[PDB]
Design an enzyme around this catalytic site. Structure first.
Site, PDB file in Angstrom:
ATOM      1  N   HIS H  19       0.900  -1.253   0.024  1.00  0.00           N
ATOM      2  CA  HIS H  19      -0.043  -0.016  -0.247  1.00  0.00           C
ATOM      3  C   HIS H  19       0.829   1.197  -0.002  1.00  0.00           C
ATOM      4  O   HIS H  19       0.440   2.506   0.532  1.00  0.00           O
ATOM      5  CB  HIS H  19      -0.962   0.067   1.224  1.00  0.00           C
TER       6      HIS H  19
HETATM    7  C1  UQ6 Z   1      -1.321  -7.778   1.102  1.00  0.00           C
HETATM    8  O1  UQ6 Z   1      -2.318  -7.600   0.178  1.00  0.00           O
HETATM    9  C2  UQ6 Z   1      -3.491  -7.855   0.434  1.00  0.00           C
HETATM   10  C3  UQ6 Z   1      -4.142  -6.884   1.130  1.00  0.00           C
HETATM   11  O2  UQ6 Z   1      -4.079  -5.729   1.190  1.00  0.00           O
HETATM   12  C4  UQ6 Z   1      -5.553  -7.503   1.656  1.00  0.00           C
HETATM   13  C5  UQ6 Z   1      -6.519  -6.391   2.178  1.00  0.00           C
HETATM   14  C6  UQ6 Z   1      -5.979  -8.706   1.336  1.00  0.00           C
HETATM   15  C7  UQ6 Z   1      -7.547  -9.177   1.605  1.00  0.00           C
HETATM   16  C8  UQ6 Z   1      -7.327  -9.828   2.870  1.00  0.00           C
HETATM   17  C9  UQ6 Z   1      -8.179  -9.892   4.079  1.00  0.00           C
HETATM   18  C10 UQ6 Z   1      -9.337  -8.952   3.912  1.00  0.00           C
HETATM   19  C11 UQ6 Z   1      -8.137 -10.658   5.107  1.00  0.00           C
HETATM   20  C12 UQ6 Z   1      -9.476 -11.318   5.799  1.00  0.00           C
HETATM   21  C13 UQ6 Z   1      -9.290 -12.477   6.386  1.00  0.00           C
HETATM   22  C14 UQ6 Z   1      -9.716 -12.924   7.534  1.00  0.00           C
HETATM   23  C15 UQ6 Z   1     -10.363 -11.768   8.511  1.00  0.00           C
HETATM   24  C16 UQ6 Z   1      -9.629 -14.226   8.106  1.00  0.00           C
HETATM   25  C17 UQ6 Z   1      -8.949 -14.117   9.545  1.00  0.00           C
HETATM   26  C18 UQ6 Z   1      -8.827 -15.485  10.101  1.00  0.00           C
HETATM   27  C19 UQ6 Z   1      -9.744 -15.840  10.929  1.00  0.00           C
HETATM   28  C20 UQ6 Z   1     -11.080 -15.020  11.394  1.00  0.00           C
HETATM   29  C21 UQ6 Z   1      -9.662 -17.200  11.365  1.00  0.00           C
HETATM   30  C22 UQ6 Z   1     -10.983 -17.873  11.669  1.00  0.00           C
HETATM   31  C23 UQ6 Z   1     -11.032 -19.387  12.227  1.00  0.00           C
HETATM   32  C24 UQ6 Z   1     -11.565 -19.677  13.266  1.00  0.00           C
HETATM   33  C25 UQ6 Z   1     -11.682 -21.202  13.542  1.00  0.00           C
HETATM   34  C26 UQ6 Z   1     -12.753 -19.016  13.856  1.00  0.00           C
HETATM   35  C27 UQ6 Z   1     -13.175 -19.530  15.114  1.00  0.00           C
HETATM   36  C28 UQ6 Z   1     -14.450 -20.242  15.255  1.00  0.00           C
HETATM   37  C29 UQ6 Z   1     -15.312 -19.949  16.151  1.00  0.00           C
HETATM   38  C30 UQ6 Z   1     -14.773 -19.104  17.339  1.00  0.00           C
HETATM   39  C31 UQ6 Z   1     -16.645 -20.676  16.549  1.00  0.00           C
HETATM   40  C32 UQ6 Z   1     -16.519 -21.840  17.487  1.00  0.00           C
HETATM   41  C33 UQ6 Z   1     -17.717 -22.759  16.965  1.00  0.00           C
HETATM   42  C34 UQ6 Z   1     -18.736 -23.118  17.909  1.00  0.00           C
HETATM   43  C35 UQ6 Z   1     -19.719 -24.044  17.415  1.00  0.00           C
HETATM   44  C36 UQ6 Z   1     -18.601 -21.982  18.998  1.00  0.00           C
HETATM   45  C37 UQ6 Z   1      -5.299  -9.687   0.783  1.00  0.00           C
HETATM   46  O3  UQ6 Z   1      -5.722 -10.864   0.503  1.00  0.00           O
HETATM   47  C38 UQ6 Z   1      -4.033  -9.366   0.252  1.00  0.00           C
HETATM   48  O4  UQ6 Z   1      -3.359 -10.272  -0.161  1.00  0.00           O
HETATM   49  C39 UQ6 Z   1      -3.395  -9.832  -1.903  1.00  0.00           C
HETATM   50  S1  FES Z   2       2.483   0.758   2.441  1.00  0.00           S
HETATM   51 FE1  FES Z   2       1.779  -1.214   2.259  1.00  0.00          FE
HETATM   52  S2  FES Z   2       3.035  -2.586   3.251  1.00  0.00           S
HETATM   53 FE2  FES Z   2       4.093  -0.639   3.253  1.00  0.00          FE
END
Ligand code: UQ6
Ligand code: FES
Ligand code: CDL
Ligand code: CDL
Ligand code: CDL
Ligand code: PCF
Ligand code: PEF
Ligand code: PEF
Ligand code: PEF
Ligand code: HEM
Ligand code: HEM
Lengths: 54, 51, 66, 57, 126, 93, 385, 53, 126
Positions: H19
């Site tokens: 970025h």
């Molecule tokens: C570097 O350049 C970029 C870039 O700038 C961006 C924004 C993205 C975009 C990426 C994102 C927006 C990331 C979003 C990803 C996430 C938010 C995933 C994060 C991981 C998790 C949330 C793990 C979740 C795993 C679990 C096991 C959840 C837990 C489960 C629960 C709590 C439920 C439990 C079950 C019961 C029945 C209670 C890119 O992919 C990228 O590379 C090209």
């Molecule tokens: S400004 Fe995007 S990784 Fe450095």
């Protein structure tokens, strides 16, 4: 008395739950072998002026 | 074969003590709140035979 | 009261009134207190949190030495 | 009288849970310390703490 | 599941003959006394499975004064089995009081159901 | 099952909608109907009238954003075309 | 009483599939959602059949994918089908949400449905990122590093939590093993959430496109709508076949086919097509904490769309200004994705910042003021005195 | 946490491809969401060589 | 969700002022004409959603004839939209007959609901 029994149960259950959560979470933390500290050496005398050595 | 015996035994002792204490407490509490129904009684008084 | 009783309406966003919030303020305050107390209880292995917990309670928790 | 204890601890659930958690914390710490100490002194010369001193000369 | 018509047939055949009766009735009473339900308060008109539809009709046909007694007996049995004790040896069921009152209300209904279920597969008649 | 909360739709026979009277729905059955009664007239005429009646609602936003994107692009490549010292440094830097 | 309503295992399927009084005026978008679910199930099936022949190391993960794409009987079909089925899943996911926004489904009766749906959305985004990390290509490894370092913004606990989740100082064996295990697990949780979505739906049924009460007449699912879902899924299957055979690499980028190398980075780092809108706003506001919080804000705003619109008339078929603003919103979304995909330069920063402002404003302020204008115009026009 | 590309940016130094963090030839952030300069690791020079650990 | 008390207040304020009325009546008429619901056969006294309980009370207050007519219009609209056509240009709802028949039955209940939500939070007064 009855509430003090219930409280003892709750306290011991809390201690146990904290310990189990600690075990489960710390099972996912960094292992022992992943803790290798890295030492690197670079030949600066061989590095030219307009170049990046990585 | 398991360079982990010392802490394994320590943890096991801790767990055994905690679980035995919790077992006894649970036995007590079960004897407690179950007593609200174990001591009940029934006195069957037959109704008047009218129909 | 002859005749109008001069009623006043208390502030409320539908259900919660100012009276109820005034009654519940210390309750929620120390409920948050108890919640953070339990939070300190749950976390023990974080070196940062353990380091923070060591100094504030030095007469009960001097347990760091090998 | 126990009426004071009841009305200060067990009348209100918030303080009851707070006390149960604080007692859990202090209990966990002291219990771990006591169990470790007992398991330690129960084995004199079987733990590396004294062997490291014995080897030193 | 096994209908009471067959039980009635086998029972009449066993009991009517003198020698087999003399050889089989002495052990039946001992079997019942050793069984267990007698002391805990159960009459045999209650222990049977009471869920299949024909027994459901039989229960629906019972007069009030026996259904209420059955209810009391079953709830008291539930309680005593809950408390793991046994009833005191003064309110048990006597040997002569285990009279079957629910049997005819099963035999009649079972006969009706059996002889109606067969009636559909009738033939041209001749 | 335990009783559940009040609901504005039920099952058949207790839909719960307002009670109606005088409505008389008919039918023709699918076998004796010759499905494609209208297949070219209906298609072309209805498709074109519906495209006409909802034409602007996508022309206006798409045209606006296309103009915006074209202007942005043209300025961008104007920046990196013999103008990196006079125009670039006055906004970028 | 008919056996269709006696056996519980079949009574359930009756109540949800065989007989369920759908409303009469349903358009093709409800079938669009059913097609979405069926895409999920085919994705799961082919994923299982994929994983039966997939390794899980980091020196032996790329070799596994090349093996499954080149040296197994009838294999490449599986791998392209998983990838392009995921891409089509995101297409249909966005379409389902857009329909929900447009026709007034997010309104009061099904706020719980809306919440469960947005939970499913964030879960699905997590799953897609996890799987995209599972390949360990060139840019996938950088994406994994960036996202696992996103959580470092949190004060105090900024280095402990990453050191936990990352399982090491650098992307290595534990990281990829953890990512693959989670990528396997979380789709089943998605399936559970789908079941919850269905239960929360059936309590009050579907909504009319006209935004009118559907409690007047209804017709059952089977023998009327099952064929509609069949035709729309035939269309989807044929278009997916067209992609998976004729032009496979169009819904993606040609960088995943590169061995992992934490030494150099591509000229442009871009997510897959379905994340560019949620990537432009990151370059938009140049505060790390602001970006990390504003992503989850961009989701929470979908959460808060209920009890924001205050037009007494549901839907946007009968509100010209509201639907015109909805269309400028959807073109805003596509422009946001596009402006993200292109590089950060002089005009592009202003483009993106204005786009974010008008996007969040449409969610927050445009909808209520436009709604009130609509309601007052309707009230005044039809009344005389 | 993505490698800046060398000899590129708005200040003749380094540019974040992710970025746009323009790191000068010194290594300080000028434009971009980066709030801190790029940290310098410990090292000990030894004649015509150097060790870093 | 937005009560008709505020809508009625805004509407009366706009209509009372003569110059603002001359400014906003023509645009309102053209808007409701382009609204795209008169042609398909809807009165505006039906488009309002039916999830709020106040709406349920409003409908439960309607007389029989209007409810039946509303049912007919809504089902016919359902069918016509299903066909993708529009009604013939003989039963298009004419402008002069878009009378408000349901607004008073919303306001009469909305006032009661508002004063119910208010009177609970009364004070002891003096
Ligand atoms: C570097 O350049 C970029 C870039 O700038 C961006 C924004 C993205 C975009 C990426 C994102 C927006 C990331 C979003 C990803 C996430 C938010 C995933 C994060 C991981 C998790 C949330 C793990 C979740 C795993 C679990 C096991 C959840 C837990 C489960 C629960 C709590 C439920 C439990 C079950 C019961 C029945 C209670 C890119 O992919 C990228 O590379 C090209
Ligand atoms: S400004 Fe995007 S990784 Fe450095
Ligand atoms: C922690 C470990 C606690 C002890 C657990 C053992 C236990 O409960 O035994 C009681 C148990 C009988 O007590 P109970 O049946 O629970 O209650 C009897 C009365 O109700 C008497 O109880 P009460 O209701 O009057 O209780 C008031 C009083 C008041 O005590 C409290 O309420 C304590 C509050 C502490 C606040 C801090 O509590 C006690 O009497 C404490 C009982 C211990 O004792 C036994 O019969 C077994 C142990 C003694 C024989 C041991 C043989 C070997
Ligand atoms: C293709 C690209 C666009 C696809 C969009 C998705 C279409 C979709 O979901 O299906 C709706 C599908 C059926 O519509 P529906 O929902 O049943 O009826 C509502 C009508 O739109 C009501 O409006 P309408 O029917 O007045 O106008 C729509 C018209 C539009 O149809 C056209 O004439 C297409 C050209 C104008 C529309 C341009 C695209 C919009 O549809 C028809 O003409 C009905 C289908 C005619 C084909 C009948 C085939 C009979 C069976 C032939 C068997 C042959 C066997 C060979 C060996 C195996 O509409 C089509 O006709 C599109 C598929 C046909 C594409 C042919 C190439
Ligand atoms: C790349 C990834 C692609 C993945 C594709 C996945 C499958 C997509 C399936 C699309 C689909 O279900 O289309 C619904 C379907 C919508 O027609 P419908 O089912 O009658 O629903 C009415 C609409 O909501 C609209 O109501 P209306 O009656 O005002 O219709 C006006 C019509 C405007 O279009 C026209 O006037 C027809 C001429 C278009 C050429 O607007 C459209 O529906 C055009 C959308 C398709 C172009 O698509 C069509 O437009 C059917 C062909 C006519
Ligand atoms: C990611 C972290 C996940 C894991 C998160 C942590 C999970 C493990 C938590 C263990 C510690 C808490 C369990 C013990 C709760 C307890 O001791 O509750 C005490 C009181 C007992 O008293 P009571 O039953 O409410 O009646 C008395 C009412 N008074 C007089 C107090 C007003 O009861 C209460 O105040 C109400 C009960 C509160 C707890 C309800 C049961 C929870 C069981 C959970 C089992 C699955 C876990
Ligand atoms: C069982 C053994 C596995 C758990 C374990 O391994 O827990 C290990 C702990 C002690 O070991 P530790 O936590 O001090 O090890 C610290 C350094 N790793 O045991 C216990 O507390 C036994 C108590 C078990 C829980 C009892 C209450 C259950 C409530 C469940 C609520 C969820
Ligand atoms: C390769 C390029 C193809 C270009 C053409 C694509 C298909 C467009 C077909 C449009 C047909 C003309 C519009 C309707 C004219 C019409 O109605 O003419 C009469 C007939 C159908 O009459 P009807 O039964 O619909 O009348 C219904 C009301 N009673 O028409 C045709 O049978 C055309 C057949 C050739 C095609
Ligand atoms: C069909 C989707 C095509 C995706 C695609 O084609 O993804 C690639 C293009 C990039 O355009 P590009 O010229 O940089 O590709 C140059 C490399 N050949 O992303 C987009 O346009 C995304 C625009 C829409 C994104 C949000 C959509 C949400 C609805
Ligand atoms: C696994 C993903 C999902 C599945 C399987 C699913 C399933 C369904 C199904 C079966 C329906 C009924 C008609 C249809 O198929 O569209 C439906 C409707 C709906 N879904 Fe989902 N859904 C999913 C994701 C979502 C998400 C992410 C949201 C919102 C954020 C959402 C919101 C809705 C809404 C609002 C309806 C409204 C129906 C009505 O108004 O008529 N769904 N969904
Ligand atoms: C639950 C069963 C699933 C399994 C076993 C599975 C397994 C896999 C595997 C092995 C890969 C490729 C690994 C790699 O390339 O190294 C992959 C990729 C992928 N999966 Fe899954 N998956 C499953 C479910 C899903 C679901 C439900 C989705 C999304 C809806 C999904 C989306 C993806 C995507 C987008 C990729 C892209 C990366 C690539 O092309 O390989 N997967 N999956």
């Amino acid at each position: 008395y009855a509430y003090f029994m219930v409280g003892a149960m709750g306290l011991l259950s809390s201690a146990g739950a904290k310990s189990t959560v600690e075990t489960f979470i710390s099972s996912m933390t960094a292992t022992a072998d992943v803790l290798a500290m890295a030492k690197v050496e670079v030949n600066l005398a061989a590095i030219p002026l307009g170049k990046n050595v990585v | 074969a398991e360079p982990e015996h010392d802490e394994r035994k320590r943890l096991g002792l801790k767990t055994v003590i905690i679980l035995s204490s919790l077992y006894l407490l649970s036995i007590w509490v079960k004897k407690f709140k179950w007593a609200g129904i174990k001591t009940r009684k029934f006195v069957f008084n037959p109704p008047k035979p009218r129909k | 009261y002859t005749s109008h009783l001069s009623s006043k309406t208390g502030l409320h966003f539908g259900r919660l009134s100012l009276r109820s919030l005034t009654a519940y303020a210390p309750n929620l305050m120390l409920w948050g207190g108890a919640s953070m107390l339990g939070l300190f209880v749950f976390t023990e292995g974080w070196p940062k949190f353990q380091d923070t917990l060591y100094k504030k309670i030095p007469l009960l928790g001097p347990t760091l030495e090998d | 009288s126990f009426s004071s204890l009841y009305k200060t601890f067990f009348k209100r659930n918030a303080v009851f849970v707070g006390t149960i958690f604080a007692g859990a914390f202090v209990f966990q710490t002291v219990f771990d310390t006591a169990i470790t100490s007992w398991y330690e002194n129960h084995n004199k010369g079987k733990l590396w703490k004294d062997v490291k001193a014995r080897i030193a000369a | 599941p096994q209908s009471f018509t067959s039980i009635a047939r086998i029972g009449d055949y066993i009991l009517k003959s003198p020698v087999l009766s003399k050889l089989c009735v002495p052990v039946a009473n001992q079997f019942i006394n050793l069984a267990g339900y007698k002391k805990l308060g159960l009459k045999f008109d209650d222990l049977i499975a009471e869920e299949n539809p024909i027994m459901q009709t039989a229960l629906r046909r019972l007069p009030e004064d026996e259904s209420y007694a059955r209810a009391y007996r079953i709830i008291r049995a539930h309680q005593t089995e809950l408390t793991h004790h046994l009833l005191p040896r003064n309110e048990w069921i006597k040997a002569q009081e285990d009279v079957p009152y629910l049997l005819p209300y099963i035999l009649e209904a079972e006969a009706a159901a059996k002889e109606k279920d067969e009636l559909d597969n009738i033939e041209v008649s001749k | 099952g335990p009783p559940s909360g009040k609901t504005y739709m039920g099952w058949w026979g207790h839909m719960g909608g307002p009670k109606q009277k005088g409505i008389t729905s008919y039918a023709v059955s699918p076998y004796a109907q010759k499905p494609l009664q209208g297949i070219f007239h209906n298609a072309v005429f209805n498709s074109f009238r519906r495209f006409k009646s909802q034409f602007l609602y996508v022309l206006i936003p798409a045209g606006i954003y296309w103009y915006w994107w074209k202007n942005g692009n043209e300025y961008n490549e104007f920046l990196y075309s013999k103008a990196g010292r006079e125009e670039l440094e006055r906004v970028n830097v | 009483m008919a056996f269709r309503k006696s056996n519980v295992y079949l009574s359930l399927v009756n109540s949800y599939i065989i007989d369920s009084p759908q409303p009469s005026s349903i358009n093709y978008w409800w079938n669009m959602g059913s097609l979405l679910g069926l895409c999920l199930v085919i994705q799961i099936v082919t994923g299982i059949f994929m994983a039966m022949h997939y390794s899980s190391n980091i020196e032996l993960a790329f070799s596994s994918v090349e093996h499954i794409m080149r040296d197994v009987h009838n294999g490449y079909i599986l791998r392209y089908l998983h990838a392009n089925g995921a891409s089509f899943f995101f297409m249909v996911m966005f379409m389902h949400m857009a329909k929900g926004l447009y026709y007034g489904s997010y309104r009061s009766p099904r706020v719980t449905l809306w919440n469960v749906g947005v939970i499913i959305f964030i879960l699905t985004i997590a799953t897609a990122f996890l799987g995209y990390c599972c390949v360990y290509g060139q840019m996938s490894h950088w994406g994994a590093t960036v996202i696992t370092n996103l959580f470092s913004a949190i004060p105090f606990v900024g280095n402990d939590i990453v050191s936990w989740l990352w399982g090491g100082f650098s992307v290595s064996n534990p990281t990829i093993q953890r990512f693959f295990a989670l990528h396997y697990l979380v789709p089943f949780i998605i399936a559970a959430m789908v079941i919850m979505h269905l239960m929360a739906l059936h309590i009050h049924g579907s909504s009319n496109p006209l935004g009118i009460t559907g409690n007047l007449d209804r017709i059952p699912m089977h023998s009327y709508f099952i064929f509609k879902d069949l035709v729309t899924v035939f269309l989807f299957m044929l278009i997916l076949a067209l992609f998976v055979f004729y032009s496979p690499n169009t819904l993606g980028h040609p960088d995943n086919y590169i061995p992992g190398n934490p030494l150099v980075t591509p000229a442009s780092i871009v997510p897959e097509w379905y994340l560019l809108p949620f990537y432009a706003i990151l370059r938009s506001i140049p505060d790390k904490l602001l970006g990390v919080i504003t992503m989850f804000a961009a989701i929470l705003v979908l959460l808060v769309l209920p009890f924001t619109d205050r037009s007494v008339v549901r839907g946007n078929t009968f509100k010209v200004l509201s639907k015109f603003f909805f269309f400028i919103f959807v073109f805003n979304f596509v422009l946001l994705g596009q402006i993200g995909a292109c590089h950060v330069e002089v005009p592009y920063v202003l483009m993106g910042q204005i786009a974010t402002f008008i996007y969040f404003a449409y969610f927050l302020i445009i909808v209520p003021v436009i709604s009130t204008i609509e309601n007052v115009l309707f009230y005044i026009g039809r009344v005389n005195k | 946490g993505c490698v800046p590309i060398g000899e590129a940016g708005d200040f003749g130094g380094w540019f974040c491809p992710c970025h746009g963090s323009h790191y000068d030839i010194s290594g300080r952030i000028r434009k971009g969401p980066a709030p801190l300069n790029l940290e310098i690791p410990a090292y000990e020079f030894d004649g015509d060589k150097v060790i870093v650990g």
